[PDB]
């Protein structure tokens, strides 16, 4: 019913008014839920507008994130990312080093490699046994950092549950089917800062990007982006298409676990972040926030009802959600 957020090269990413799922009469609620599902089943991406998270709070959260990344290099490494099983803390991709152990076939590539021009900080739920968040010190500009981000984590946690309900309603299964699979909130709030960079850097280092192509791992990802642009989604014809920023929208995409969970009725689509499409000498800083939603780590993941007719259509063996994720997170090391 809304004009598509993206409509190019066979890639159609719908723009959906989420308040119509939450506040509509039964007919409108079903129409919206079906629009949401259909978006996931085709593009694997949707844009939501009029979500319960408020614009001025989102802007406060973006300012708060920007204050963290202005912190000195040493203060950010203090709260550094440790292990894949914690998946919490600060990181910036380093350049790989040639060493005595390295194979000479790889040396030409290692020297030419260009790491993503980004830095990140990841926050998990506060009360996970054995995995506390490495919070920075609450002083000067970072007073309120914790309470703000925990607040935002819980609002995104609520939105996750609501988007899965829309998926359930659109599938015509029990509206609350996913609740017990996602109620723990084993999610990851990834704050991202892509620093100001000269456009010539992308010519000097050919193949250089802001974020490498990938699929996300979990159920869904709530992606809040600023107005800079650069996010691209891969079309059915194999081309990366610009996911244009639209004010007060959240870009929502399915991850590999939901794809598998859905018996591949829902798509998990390749995406990346390159230079903004506009031509300029210097690209200003880009801020985004990726809230990775996952099934409960304890959840066992096998085909959702109504995603297959005969058992022979089930493409995948059952897996534990938690184990799967750590394998994805630990693979690159
Ligand atoms: O920054 C963005 O717009 C996308 C980042 C992303 O896809 C990710 O962190 O997984
Ligand atoms: O926890 C994470 N980290 C990174 C990704 C992909 O960028 C993901 O999907 N989930
Ligand atoms: Ni991603």
From TrEMBL:
UniProt: Ca(2+) binding residues: 214, 216, 271
BP terms from Gene Ontology: small molecule biosynthetic process
Domain (Fe2OG dioxygenase): residue spans on this chain: 185-295
InterPro entries hit by this protein: DIOX_N, IPNS-like_FE2OG_OXY, IPNS-like_sf, Iron_ascorbate_oxido_reductase, Oxoglu/Fe-dep_dioxygenase_dom
Residues annotated as binding 2-oxoglutarate: 190, 194, 286, 288
Keywords associated with the record: Calcium, Dioxygenase, Iron, Metal-binding, Oxidoreductase
Family: Belongs to the iron/ascorbate-dependent oxidoreductase family.
Protein name: Thymine dioxygenase
Natural source organism: Neurospora crassa (strain ATCC 24698 / 74-OR23-1A / CBS 708.71 / DSM 1257 / FGSC 987)
